[PDB]
Amino acid sequence: AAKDVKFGNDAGVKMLRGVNVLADAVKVTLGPKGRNVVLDKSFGAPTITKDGVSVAREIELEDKFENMGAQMVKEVASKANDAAGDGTTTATVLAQAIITEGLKAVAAGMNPMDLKRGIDKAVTVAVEELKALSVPCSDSKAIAQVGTISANSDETVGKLIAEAMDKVGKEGVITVEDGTGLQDELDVVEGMQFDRGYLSPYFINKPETGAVELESPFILLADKKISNIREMLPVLEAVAKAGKPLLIIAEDVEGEALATLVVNTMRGIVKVAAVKAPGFGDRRKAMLQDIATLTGGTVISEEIGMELEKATLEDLGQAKRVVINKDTTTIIDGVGEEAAIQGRVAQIRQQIEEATSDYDREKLQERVAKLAGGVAVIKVGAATEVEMKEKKARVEDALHATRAAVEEGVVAGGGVALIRVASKLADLRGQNEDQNVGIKVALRAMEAPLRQIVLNCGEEPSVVANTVKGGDGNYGYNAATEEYGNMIDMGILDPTKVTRSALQYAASVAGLMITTECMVTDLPK
Amino acid sequence: AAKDVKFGNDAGVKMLRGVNVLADAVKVTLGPKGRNVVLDKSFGAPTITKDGVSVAREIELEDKFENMGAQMVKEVASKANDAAGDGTTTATVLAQAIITEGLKAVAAGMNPMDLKRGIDKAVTVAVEELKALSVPCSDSKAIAQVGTISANSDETVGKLIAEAMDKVGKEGVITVEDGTGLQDELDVVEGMQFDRGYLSPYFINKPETGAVELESPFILLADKKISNIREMLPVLEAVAKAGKPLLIIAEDVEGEALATLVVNTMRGIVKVAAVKAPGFGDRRKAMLQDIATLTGGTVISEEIGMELEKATLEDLGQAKRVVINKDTTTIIDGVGEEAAIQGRVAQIRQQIEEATSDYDREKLQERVAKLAGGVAVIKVGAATEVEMKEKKARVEDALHATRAAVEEGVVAGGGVALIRVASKLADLRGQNEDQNVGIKVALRAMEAPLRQIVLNCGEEPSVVANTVKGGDGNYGYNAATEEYGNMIDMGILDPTKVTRSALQYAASVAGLMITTECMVTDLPK
């Protein structure tokens, strides 16, 4: 259709207005004193939230160009979310800060490309510096603290997460479900859990959790790669009857075969999901067997001259339920008999005795623990369905944040880490003045998170910012108590990973907008 | 009446639009290749001109705020005109260049007061530098050359001015009056000239020169203030007869008396003009006497118990012609007898001998010079009233330009002097970045004149500017021949005085607009 086309400044003011509406709506929810945002619903009462992502999803503007600016920066939160699962609001205020000053510099006549280069250089060095300052979240105490902090100071949620990770390990699978009513519940189910997700989406039958769930399915344990569907045809049909879904746990399911499975299960033609076998090399085969012993199946390896074509429903393993995430497979309640299973345990138990290497020893103990990984399930307390659904949300977020914290060290929270980094880069320079302005734009935007947190408290941003910059190290402002102190000692930490991600995605989208010269959209008609 | 009030940016864009319309209409007339501007008349054929002042006078805009901007910058040309009588177009392009970039800097967020301070510092240093590059027009040959060139190559006008300056000295008073018909006339009258203009307009009988001219008038020399007309009645009537105009040279003519004179001479009822007596205090009386000795009059002072009522046409002085400007009175060819006059000279001549103070010595030498300086009068040739009136105008301008040339000096024309000055200030800095921006705004504006001259030629401004800046000294672009060369050798010179004035007035008005925050005007109703 006929288009409306805008250039330079005309386009710039439109974009800026669009990012401001989005960022302003989102940033009021930042930190312990975040404010509420009410989102209208077509039916019933409006939604009241302090969740940034929830607000962003609702933002769409009337002016086509302003809407483009809003949808562009909205990409910042979504990418930061996908990558770290937290810090989307932080990423949004960093982006607004960089875009605002960057566009001002452009309007002033500065070279957009140089501005972007300067911003990029500052971010590159800032990230290195962020790593240098990064400390860990390994022990259960740290995990508890981060969990508590991520749960709005709810020490309860903190303990839960810590206990759940103590059961299945901090790398294990953990889920949260509605509670039976009052008092939380934590139980490990099959069963076993290993680090391997679906070999492709679509298998996802429950987009609510973005996971795949199968009930009383058959489990094919093939010790090899599967490229040709032909091999599956015989077993797939055997499973076609008995009306039960099939879980493929092979060394890997490549294009040809995988593509077919995706299409067939897409047409209701037999429900089948595929995931890679745990580990690699030798231990892979040994582990693929542990699953067999657990599900009562039989490994189909070519090493013993076995063919998938010559595989009956008797070779297949089976369990009451199996769940698979983007990167986790959990088999709940397997058919395997305690005789075989417990016997398998005894075997591996001796393996540990004959262990001549710590590495081999560790790997073996990992198997016995799993067989004797599973899935830790957290059932949220209650006392009224409303509160129960709420606490469930908090536990979910706290878990998500703590998981991120465990993966990559931690740094002082409350926006102080970025402020310390910015101060260390005061002498950073580029190839020219415009690049230097870009560097300064980035260092200035690095104070935005702390300033917005303070602003949401009802305090003065410049005063608090000035005071924090005055000290050093982990010295920061505790917005919950409105007292200065050592952020680490007060338990206010952020996973280095979310801080880094927030900054990189903010600078990335900001750089693109700053170097945008023209915009095209449908004519308002 | 109700007002429309605008602030900041809103006011700024209006002002800018207004100066742009005025400056753009005016600047097309700059230099040897200036284009024509057609100005509509209510009757007959339109006026076609290449004269900047003529164009500026017609500019008035419909938008009240835009019109304010145009009228404001119009002040630049008028002041530059009053001070140097040339370079009003140059001053206008300089003002537009400073205003344009200055307002851009303001919109960019820079401090107006600092921008103005930087612009002012640059101009202060630029003027000093202009003086340093300034070169002489001392001998009559040079005076004749400059005069000829200023008279559109009319060697006649050049000789006239040179002779006039040879009579009364290059620092002496010189006037131009209509000729008696064919052939020019140069005669020195009492002549004498002092710094006192008409005590009010209206007396101005020749708005062409905005001056008052009287022929063979009587001169009343009253040593006191005149408030009551009664005192004049007797003498005014005595002058009513003999059909001759009257020149009142009293200590001062206050309201009552002055008001009457303005009304009567307004109705053709006796032609009379009044001007204050030269000097003040004691010397005043001594000087009032010098005029008497020159015009053959008698000072009527109350000190000797004399009354204006008891004053006959015999007491009054007389001269063939007298001319008075806004601030100058010149008595040409007085009746006084060489015996009395020369004797008076001898007296004052001894006064200088007995002088015990330099000040008293200086003041005395001033009187002898006037009485022994007079006023040279140039009566322009003729051969038809039309041509006579035209040549008179040329002589007036040429004279004005030569006068300035004699005082200072000259610099390379074609805008190169300002370009050379700008390059010499490349390292100039202020107290902060905003002041530095102001400095750059001014140095950049200094290139506008040469650029506009080139643009009017139909050539490329940036190319020529780049080439001229590449060379040094008097190297410049001859817009008439479109060849580079030594501006002085090619005879392209500007009086340092007009270049300095154009720059100072441009900067002065630009500084005011740049620091304007609010505009008030009548509601368009």
Ligand SMILES: Nc1ncnc2c1ncn2[C@@H]1O[C@H](COP(=O)(O)OP(=O)(O)OP(=O)(O)O)[C@@H](O)[C@H]1O
């Ligand atoms: N007591 C506290 N004082 C200061 N800052 C705190 C405190 N508790 C938490 N924070 C900080 O608040 C920020 C996180 O706030 P919030 O969860 O509202 O936004 P986000 O994680 O950036 O985005 P999302 O909307 O995805 O949660 C981090 O900088 C965190 O360290």
Ligand SMILES: [K+]
């Ligand atoms: K929040």
Ligand SMILES: [Mg+2]
């Ligand atoms: Mg968060």
